[PDB]
């Protein structure tokens, strides 16, 4: 759907993409 990778991309950024 693209709802998780949209809200989960926040905490995952701190590691990669922060």
**Whole-number Cα distances in Å, 2 to 5, 6, 16, 18:** 6, 6, 18, 20
**Whole-number Cα distances in Å, 15 to 2, 7, 10:** 20, 15, 10
Q: What is the C-alpha radius of gyration for the chain, rounded to an integer number of angstroms?
A: 8
Cα separation, 3 vs 1, in Å, equals: 6
Tell me, rounded to whole angstroms, the distance of Cα 18 from its chain centroid.
10
Structure determination method: NMR
Cα separation, 4 vs 13, in Å, equals: 13
- Which DSSP string corresponds to 2-15? -SHHHHTTTTTTTT
- 11's tokens: 């905490």
């Amino acid at each position: 759907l693209g709802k998780y990778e949209q809200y989960i991309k926040w905490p995952w950024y701190v590691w990669l993409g922060f």
